[PDB]
Amino acid sequence: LLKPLPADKQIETGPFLEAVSHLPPFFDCLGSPVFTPIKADISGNITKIKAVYDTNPAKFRTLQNILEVEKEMYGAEWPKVGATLALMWLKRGLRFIQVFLQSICDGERDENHPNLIRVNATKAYEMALKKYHGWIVQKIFQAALYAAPYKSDFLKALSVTEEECLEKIRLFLVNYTATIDVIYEMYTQMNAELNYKV
Amino acid sequence: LLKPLPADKQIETGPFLEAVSHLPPFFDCLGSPVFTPIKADISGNITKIKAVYDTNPAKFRTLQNILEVEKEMYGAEWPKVGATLALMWLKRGLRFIQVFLQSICDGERDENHPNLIRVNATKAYEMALKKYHGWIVQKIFQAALYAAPYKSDFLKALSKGQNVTEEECLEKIRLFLVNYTATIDVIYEMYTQMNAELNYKV
Numbered sequence A: 001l002l003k004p005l006p007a008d009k010q011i012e013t014g015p016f017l018e019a020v021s022h023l024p025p026f027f028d029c030l031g032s033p034v035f036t037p038i039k040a041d042i043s044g045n046i047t048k049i050k051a052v053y054d055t056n057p058a059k060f061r062t063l064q065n066i067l068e069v070e071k072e073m074y075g076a077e078w079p080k081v082g083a084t085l086a087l088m089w090l091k092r093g094l095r096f097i098q099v100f101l102q103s104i105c106d107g108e109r110d111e112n113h114p115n116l117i118r119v120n121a122t123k124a125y126e127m128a129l130k131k132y133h134g135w136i137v138q139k140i141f142q143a144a145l146y147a148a149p150y151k152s153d154f155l156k157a158l159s160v161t162e163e164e165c166l167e168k169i170r171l172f173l174v175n176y177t178a179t180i181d182v183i184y185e186m187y188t189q190m191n192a193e194l195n196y197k198v
Numbered sequence B: 001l002l003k004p005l006p007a008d009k010q011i012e013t014g015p016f017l018e019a020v021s022h023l024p025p026f027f028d029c030l031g032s033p034v035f036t037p038i039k040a041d042i043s044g045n046i047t048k049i050k051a052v053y054d055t056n057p058a059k060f061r062t063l064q065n066i067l068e069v070e071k072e073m074y075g076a077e078w079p080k081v082g083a084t085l086a087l088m089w090l091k092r093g094l095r096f097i098q099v100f101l102q103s104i105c106d107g108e109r110d111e112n113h114p115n116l117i118r119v120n121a122t123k124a125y126e127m128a129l130k131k132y133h134g135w136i137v138q139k140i141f142q143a144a145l146y147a148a149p150y151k152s153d154f155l156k157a158l159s160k161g162q163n164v165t166e167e168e169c170l171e172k173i174r175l176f177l178v179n180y181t182a183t184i185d186v187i188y189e190m191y192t193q194m195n196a197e198l199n200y201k202v
């Protein structure tokens, strides 16, 4: 469990990194090597933010410290630089995981094919990543969906019943959603969000 | 350039690793983020072979030493393990680069769609990797060719900064290919002789 947001809504870097380093394996529960590059991309971001943090933990104590310090340090290159860029991408993946799991927990599905995960992953993708992907990467997303597991199999890998698995997940989603929201609002407030497409 | 093959055809782990270290950036010359995971995968292999070798340059002096030693270390798990597995996959990416450049150089081409490299990448894929990829990854490869550059850009990017003609670029590549092609053929031969090749698919 991620720690809850303090009153001031600031996120301490070290403990954020520690918690989110546990999430790349989420993609291993999908059950196919097709999803390895996704895990590697999210891990990459985390590694890079950690590297910046470790150069000076006091100065980069919060995620906000990271953005404001880097903004001065890189001037006209910022925000397409350093840990600011890595976190800009990381939050999108983290949002995918949030929308995806929330959707599953809320019982969104295709009534004709309730044990697929297509409508949920497609929803998450739409809300988290689609806007930042060119048409070629979107066609790759579509191919990758044919590697998706059965919902029941994914929930089994995420592990002690299935009805509770969903409840553990709902409990996880509280502070996770709240933290991700704060990070997005931070990017918006600092005009650190970019829109280029891969 | 890669060191030449000696008489004994034993490939020295340290130089080889140093030479192939220059190759992952090849994929950056393709000009799209779509090829990044391929860069990362080949780099991964190189790094893993280095981590095993660094533990004892002497015991792992040769590529053939890696296979011999690991065979003993890991028993029934081998060859699906360590640097042997890493190089099993590395060789396939290296052969992709071999076949693809070789093709380009030799011509080939389509010319109902004249200056797209779909045909050269495709030959290279078929001959090096397709057999080890299941239908989803192959479908992914198909979508990824849409991101492939035109020929000239590619060559432009390969020599980038040095100031060369297309013709000059090509012959530089041809020169490179001699100890590279020879070296990759020897690695493939070693895997066959040591019964270290696996055929599982991704």
Ligand SMILES: CCCCCC
Pocket (backbone or CB within 6 Å): A080, A193, A194, A195, A196
């Ligand atoms: C480099 C991408 C810019 C997006 C902001 C409008």
